[PDB]
Amino acid sequence: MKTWPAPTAPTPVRATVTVPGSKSQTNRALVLAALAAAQGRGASTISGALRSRDTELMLDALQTLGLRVDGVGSELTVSGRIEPGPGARVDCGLAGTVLRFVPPLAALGSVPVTFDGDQQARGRPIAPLLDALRELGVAVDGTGLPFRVRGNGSLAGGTVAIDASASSQFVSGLLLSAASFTDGLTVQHTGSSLPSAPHIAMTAAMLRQAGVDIDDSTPNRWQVRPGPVAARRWDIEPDLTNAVAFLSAAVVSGGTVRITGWPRVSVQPADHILAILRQLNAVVIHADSSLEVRGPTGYDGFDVDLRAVGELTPSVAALAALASPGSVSRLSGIAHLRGHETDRLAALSTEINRLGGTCRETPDGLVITATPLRPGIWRAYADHRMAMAGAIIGLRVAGVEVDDIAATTKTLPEFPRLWAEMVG
Numbered sequence: 001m002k003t004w005p006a007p008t009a010p011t012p013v014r015a016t017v018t019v020p021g022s023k024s025q026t027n028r029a030l031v032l033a034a035l036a037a038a039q040g041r042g043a044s045t046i047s048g049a050l051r052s053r054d055t056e057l058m059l060d061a062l063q064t065l066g067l068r069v070d071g072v073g074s075e076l077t078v079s080g081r082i083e084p085g086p087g088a089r090v091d092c093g094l095a096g097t098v099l100r101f102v103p104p105l106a107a108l109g110s111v112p113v114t115f116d117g118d119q120q121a122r123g124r125p126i127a128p129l130l131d132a133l134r135e136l137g138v139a140v141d142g143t144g145l146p147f148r149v150r151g152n153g154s155l156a157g158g159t160v161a162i163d164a165s166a167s168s169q170f171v172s173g174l175l176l177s178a179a180s181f182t183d184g185l186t187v188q189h190t191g192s193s194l195p196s197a198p199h200i201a202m203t204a205a206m207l208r209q210a211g212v213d214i215d216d217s218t219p220n221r222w223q224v225r226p227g228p229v230a231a232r233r234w235d236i237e238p239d240l241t242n243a244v245a246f247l248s249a250a251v252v253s254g255g256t257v258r259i260t261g262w263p264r265v266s267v268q269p270a271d272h273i274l275a276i277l278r279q280l281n282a283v284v285i286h287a288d289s290s291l292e293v294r295g296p297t298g299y300d301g302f303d304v305d306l307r308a309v310g311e312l313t314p315s316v317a318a319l320a321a322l323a324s325p326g327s328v329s330r331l332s333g334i335a336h337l338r339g340h341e342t343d344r345l346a347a348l349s350t351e352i353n354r355l356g357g358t359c360r361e362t363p364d365g366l367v368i369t370a371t372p373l374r375p376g377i378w379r380a381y382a383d384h385r386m387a388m389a390g391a392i393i394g395l396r397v398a399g400v401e402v403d404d405i406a407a408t409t410k411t412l413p414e415f416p417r418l419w420a421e422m423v424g
């Protein structure tokens with residue numbers, strides 16, 4: 001595979017960028033549309049849907065379960081029933097949302113469904129959710145990929161306790177289908193350290209838009225009452241995590257990037273994101289239904305807690321590597337990133353140090369000292385966000401090439417073109 005050379009920015013980037021739909025919201029919408037359709041409420045359409053490997057895996061997973069998903073562009077229509085064929089096998093790829101959100105959904109069917117995924121997906125956490133499904137009555141063969149969910153057309157629900165410290169998607173995955181369990185569900189996260197609170201809140205918010213009653217008034221506990229899931233039209237926001245890769249270009253070059261269609265009120269953690277950018281003295285404004293970010297002339301080291309927004313770590317690590325020389329930055333709260341697409345703390349450490357940088361993995365994150373960097377091959381680990389972090393570095397370091405920019409197809413198949421258009 002040819003490498004992809006990351007274009008440099010010898011002068012401030014200036015651009016208006018449109019990023020496609022949110023992966024997290026798209027895949028929640030597809031699951032909820034499938035439940036409504038499986039419940040006999042009719043077809044649903046998702047407008048502005050992300051088309052990427054993770055959402056194609058999700059819609060193929062629903063089709064494996066018997067549903068129909070139509071649409072060649074960003075408008076997807078879900079219909080039909082859960083009625084899996086003999087030997088049904090969901091391919092999870094490297095999509096945690098498919099791996100975690102579809103096995104509950106599938107216990108509603110009356111035929112078992114096998115789950116498999118990429119070799120690299122088999123190293124990602126999944127066993128706690130399968131134990132929880134077993135506690136709720138579902139027969140599950142296997143404690144890791146490949147595993148089979150042997151449903152008998154129904155799932156009684158009830159109360160269940162789970163350690164979800166390794167992934168909020170263990171909670172989201174159970175919450176999304178719980179309205180179709182006979183008794184609904186009460187889910188209790190045991191212990192502490194629950195990452196990605198905004199993605200669980202995302203789940204709860206979209207469940208309420210589908211008419212589902214969910215009580216999240218007590219931390220670490222969620223009660224969902226049994227009831228209908230409405231068929232409705234979903235409007236998908238731009239992916240704000242992907243937007244940060246482009247906004248970072250403004251930050252490191254002292255330029256100006258605008259993102260179109262930014263929601264002033266979002267189901268995504270927009271407030272965390274904008275606060276972080278302002279930590280680096282970026283000027284952030286909302287204008288013309290767009291978000292504008294103007295980078296500072298330079299920035300020093302920063303400390304940032306990424307527990308609630310860990311998927312920002314690759315881009316934020318790149319920003320830290322590009323701070324003024326001798327700056328020290330501390331990224332914390334992200335032990336769980338050892339279980340992501342790749343171990344992102346080891347990978348970021350490895351690739352930054354290869355460019356001559358200074359990145360030290362810590363038990364919950366990274367400490368990065370900004371030092372002059374040099375050309376190299378920034379290696380993707382099949383991880384869309386590692387790939388875009390390489391692009392960010394390359395803005396300020398000539399001679400940086402990403403081995404596998406096509407890794408970006410996970411959530412942004414058009415990255416290479418959009419990025420070229422931005423940097424110009």
Ligand SMILES: O=C(O)C1=C[C@@H](OP(=O)(O)O)[C@@H](O)[C@H](O)C1
Nearest residue numbers: 024167168169172195196199311
């Ligand atoms: O539910 C979601 O859509 C996701 C939740 C988070 O997972 P973890 O809590 O496992 O990090 C996030 O990092 C992931 O990229 C998307």
